[PDB]
Design a protein that fits this description.
This is part of a larger assembly, with 2 copies of chain A, 2 copies of chain C, 1 copy of chain E (49 residues), 1 copy of chain F (443 residues) and 1 copy of chain G (101 residues). Chain A has 421 residues and is α+β, with helices and mostly antiparallel strands. Chain A folds into 2 domains: 1-209, 2-Layer Sandwich (Cytochrome Bc1 Complex, Chain A, domain 1), CATH 3.30.830; 221-421, 2-Layer Sandwich (Cytochrome Bc1 Complex, Chain A, domain 1), CATH 3.30.830. Chain A is built from 15 helices and 11 strands. Chain A has a 6-stranded mixed β-sheet, with helices on both faces. In chain A, a hairpin with a 4-residue loop joins strand 4 and strand 5. The termini of chain A are far apart. In chain C, 59% of the residues lie in helices and 0% in strands. Chain C is flat, with a radius of gyration of 16 Å. The longest helix of chain C is centred in the last third of the chain and has 20 residues, at 33-52. Chain F folds into 2 domains: 13-226, 2-Layer Sandwich (Cytochrome Bc1 Complex, Chain A, domain 1); 238-441, 2-Layer Sandwich (Cytochrome Bc1 Complex, Chain A, domain 1). Chain F has 17 helices and 12 strands. The radius of gyration of chain F is 23 Å and the shape is globular. Helices cover 58% and strands 0% of the residues of chain G. Chain G has 4 helices and no strands. Chain G is an all-alpha fold and 101 residues long. Classes of the chains: A alpha+beta (421), C mainly alpha (54), E mainly alpha (49), F alpha+beta (443), G mainly alpha (101). Chains in contact: A-B, A-F, A-G, C-G, D-F, E-F. The interface between D and F is small, with 4 and 7 residues. The complex binds protoporphyrin IX containing FE (2 copies). Residues 42, 45-46, 49-50, 52-53 of chain D line the site of one protoporphyrin IX containing FE (HEM). Chain D: This is Cytochrome b. Chain D: The chain crosses the membrane at residues 34-54. Chain D: Belongs to the cytochrome b family. Chain D: It is found in: Mitochondrion inner membrane. Chain B: This is Cytochrome b-c1 complex subunit 2, mitochondrial.
Chain lengths: 421, 220, 54, 55, 49, 443, 101
Amino acid sequence: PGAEDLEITKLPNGLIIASLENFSPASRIGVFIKAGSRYETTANLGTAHLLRLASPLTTKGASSFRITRGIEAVGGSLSVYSTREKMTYCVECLRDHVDTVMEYLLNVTTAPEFRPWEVTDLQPQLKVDKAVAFQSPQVGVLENLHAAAYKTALANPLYCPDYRIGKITSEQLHHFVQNNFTSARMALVGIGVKHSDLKQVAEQFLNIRSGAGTSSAKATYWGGEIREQNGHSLVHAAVVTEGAAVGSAEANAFSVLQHVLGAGPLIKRGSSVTSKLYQGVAKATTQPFDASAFNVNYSDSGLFGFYTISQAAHAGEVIRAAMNQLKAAAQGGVTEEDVTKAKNQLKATYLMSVETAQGLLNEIGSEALLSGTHTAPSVVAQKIDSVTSADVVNAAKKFVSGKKSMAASGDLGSTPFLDEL
Amino acid sequence: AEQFLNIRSGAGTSSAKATYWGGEIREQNGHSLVHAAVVTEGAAVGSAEANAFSVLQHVLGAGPLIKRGSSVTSKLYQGVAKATTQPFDASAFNVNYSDSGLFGFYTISQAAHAGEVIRAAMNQLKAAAQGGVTEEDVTKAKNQLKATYLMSVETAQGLLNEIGSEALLSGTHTAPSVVAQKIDSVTSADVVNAAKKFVSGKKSMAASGDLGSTPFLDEL
Amino acid sequence: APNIRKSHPLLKMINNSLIDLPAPSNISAWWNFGSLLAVCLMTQILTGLLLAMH
Amino acid sequence: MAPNIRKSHPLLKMINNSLIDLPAPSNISAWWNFGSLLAVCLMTQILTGLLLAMH
Amino acid sequence: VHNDVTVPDFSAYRREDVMDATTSSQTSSEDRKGFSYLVTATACVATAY
Amino acid sequence: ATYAQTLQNIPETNVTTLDNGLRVASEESSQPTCTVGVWIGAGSRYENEKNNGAGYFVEHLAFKGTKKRPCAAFEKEVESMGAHFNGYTSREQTAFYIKALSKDMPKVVELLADVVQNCALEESQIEKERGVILQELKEMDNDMTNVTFDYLHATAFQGTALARTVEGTTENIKHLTRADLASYIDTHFKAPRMVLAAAGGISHKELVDAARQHFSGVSFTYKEDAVPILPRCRFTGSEIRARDDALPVAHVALAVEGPGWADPDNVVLHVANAIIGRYDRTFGGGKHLSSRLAALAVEHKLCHSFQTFNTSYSDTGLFGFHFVADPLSIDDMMFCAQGEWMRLCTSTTESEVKRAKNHLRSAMVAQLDGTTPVCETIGSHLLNYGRRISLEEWDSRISAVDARMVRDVCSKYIYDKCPALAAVGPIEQLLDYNRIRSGMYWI
Amino acid sequence: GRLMDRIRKWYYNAAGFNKYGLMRDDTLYEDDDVKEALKRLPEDLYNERMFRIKRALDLSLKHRILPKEQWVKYEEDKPYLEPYLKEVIRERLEREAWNKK
Ligand code: HEM
Ligand code: HEM
């Protein structure tokens, strides 16, 4: 019976419920939420990070001990992914245990006790968590990027700043959950389950009243430049401009310009010929490198540009070469066939993204959260290819003309400043 | 010297020219107090335009002269004072290097009032750029400047440093009279010009503390 | 180590059990019998040997 | 405190630090055997000595 | 690099039954151990005696 | 819709064999996207002292173009259709696979066949990759975990073929000839030793057809259609210690010889490993984790991480564990680790296996999360078991496992065995072989 | 009938730990459960307990007690630790129970 429906109710309090039965032996339920470091202010920075790690602490219904033992008892799992503006709490497990695993998912997101001692004990973990994440230079410059790109909200780091480790309080965690984990900002998405079932759980257990709680400040663009000189042999650099926000015909344009420029490798150890940006940078330097079209879409804003990685001595030429590929593209240097191919890679990528349970559940929930609906994989494809070569060249122009923000780390001895691009 | 100093001659490796950037660095560290400094390319060592800034410095406010006392002869302090009620501190910043210099103001204030305190410091600079500088102000400043320089050389460390610094950047020694002669011979025009070069030139800023209310360089 | 009372392998021991040893400030006379017992032991042994020799 | 008694226990700790986990040079010859033989003579002399002393 | 590292040859020391690289060593394991443990058990017997 | 039911309703895996000896298998679903690839029974184990690292060298050219279409052409064509081209080479298995729109399943099959049959082996490209491979060997040399596992094989299977690393020696990489690679390909990439697997929304009959069309070149003699049985690799209880107190943490791996693919006991060993589990400093669970070893690790801060493993092969395997720890906590970690291994053979509980069985089920289900992973299962299964094994069969087998069975099987492979040890980094605190060997009994 | 109150108030005064200025909870023997509970006390409640104890030990060594006006009153004795201690023991029993299950 692989011809099931993708139902999606929406209770009165505003809580959206999207489910889908693919008869997979494994179910994967999740609680999507419009929360994140975006809603933090100077006073409570990092509270969202800690809240992420606080998932295993004791709740009003389950103890720290039972949360962990319980889920493990049935080969289940519990994790929490989060972006600057959204948090997802999901659990996976064999079909016959969805009941068991559910109790916990529930308690965690709606009935936390944030006991003072348990919180105090957990805070040193922020150093550790942050330490392993920062082993990828990628993560470090993206933090600085957002801090140069904005003055507020999205400018906040995704990992708790150092001066605040150990300073976050239980009050702060409670207040955060109270003012953000509201029924009208949450969505209960599920896979390998039956809508009637999932729907029932929601209306019966999910409480914590509706509202939009504290609303987040508007994202103000800054166009700054942060340079972390740390001596590494490799230099990571990212240059962006304010791009389209989530839900926009402008978005699609950039998505395509992205794939037209070069959005990641397709062949192992292979060169990317279909990549304007890569191929361009390649012609400029002889040493190992990496260039890509960077693209982020947020609720009320976005960022677009290119991310490079190069040897220190050749950082200069590698970054300037990436720039020319953008100007050149803004000046009609975009074939009509290029736009065709990119549209394939874009349609393919999106389509592959949903092969894995994590990817599917995330697709459903994200949309079912930002508009309690579900676009058909055909309408999305329909919307994408219906993007003229004009659109793309325009996107490219918005970049060359807009104010830019840059972030670079490594031995910046030869890395150019934003005003020399 | 001659009988013992052997590491020999040359100008050794020369240093690269100082290129101005005009960037902005913000260290958000949560401290109750916010330190912030806004500057502009100022004058170089020996640059005639030096004294002009030195004087504009003392005209704006270059450090306290009375213990726990207010600085009335301080345009900048007095101006900031009128703006905020809480504890603070504002001063004219000024540095002169071989091939460049920096000029502006340095503030320290509670986090919540960092905004108004910094903006108030700016107005005192515009206002000064727009002839808002008495001819008496320039007279007083020239006193504080002549006095300061003269006191600087009271301690052995200060004297030796005075001699050496000049004896290094020009193997000579200006008489304490020629220096005074050069200083007071600075018109009120000069000063107002210096003040202008600041309001018009590209600025660079650096601030640390709980910058939640600290304005960005492009909001000044 | 700056002072022998703590570094020396033998003194270290005398120091950690009879000089720098942390003791409750409020132990009464009922806590005296431990050392008295120790002295009885040393005393009994000493006089015992003297007797054994005859 | 310690996962294994051989290291935590105040008495075993001692036997362990002098007869089990004690670090020893890999190349000591038979001339390094007499120390323990001496210790065994001592215990042996004492044992037989008490037995003789009893008569 | 570590790839350029190989365990030396212990033929001058290997017990007869594990000398050949193309033969499972598990088939002679119980004999190899049984023997060694036999010596030990015997020493315990003599000692107990 | 119960777990049982979902397992029974999973589309069956279809297999058919061409006259040349090649096997074509595929599991059908309703996905617009799919993955298809050719899993070859080849690897470093099949190489020898002179051509070691050839299979790897080949893996580097298998994507730089064929005869029908040079580099640029080959690349552009694959890229321009939004398909992903990946692959890998291990000790006993190799694979080249593509991800794309089911709508191209046929063009892809043609592409695959062209790769495995007509690799250009551009004389100039070879010298170019010679230098690339040499850079990857220096990169991988800093991967302690992989340096450690290589060493584990180097000593555990010393003197044999499984002792060599997949990437090969520096000397070999510096001297492999265009002819050697050519020879490699011809000797090993042969129909009977390969498997065309695909998963997603694809027609088994349409797959098998494109297969007949491109995978042809049948064999004449008998020596061309026989799958050569490899000579046995002797396991050796021993240790290799690479000390460098300059390294921040130490890696340690201990292991005993395992049974080999075809043995049913592997279902039990995997349940066993499920009881001990694994851990790393970012497991929120912390001190409440079910895995005893993990709990102790947390309480006494025994390590940064640890993991169990049951690496199978045709006729042998490696069952053991691996941990990373500070120089001063190696001894306690090894102690607790070997302790848990003894508990297994001696005191496993029904509750313990119950949990471990569940954990293992969702583990097998997770290895079929996408087209590529499912396609990987097929390639491997036919190549190792000569047939696909359904989740329902596994589950059937997993369900039969009980405490007693765990103790008996573990006692069989672990108790009083001479292990293989590999230690790298600041390992002064790790006690000698003899002491470790004693940790192999009583518990 | 209020017989306990009669008895419990008698014992409280008979015990006499209140003559040192100690709360009932200050006198508990620090076994495993108590030790854990103490770790959960809020800073101030912890520092207050410490002073009372250090002070009592001082009284004990001096062989004095507090002036009758400072003795804690049966109805003003704060059971500051009992709540925590109870949670601790509950949790422990839960783990214990679950580890047999
Ligand atoms: C724990 C320590 C000791 C205790 C409790 C102890 C107790 C006694 C007692 C109850 C007597 C009998 C006294 C009597 O004549 O009424 C005695 C006799 C004796 N003890 Fe000890 N003794 C101790 C240690 C020693 C030692 C260490 C030696 C000698 C190395 C020793 C040697 C003697 C001798 C020679 C006598 C017999 C002569 C006599 O009775 O006066 N004693 N001891
Ligand atoms: C370092 C340990 C000892 C040494 C070097 C030692 C040595 C000797 C020697 C040289 C003799 C004379 C043997 C002979 O008759 O020719 C002797 C006699 C004796 N020893 Fe020891 N002895 C030791 C410990 C002891 C101890 C601990 C005791 C009893 C508690 C003891 C009790 C005796 C007795 C009773 C005799 C007299 C009977 C006899 O001579 O056979 N000895 N010892």
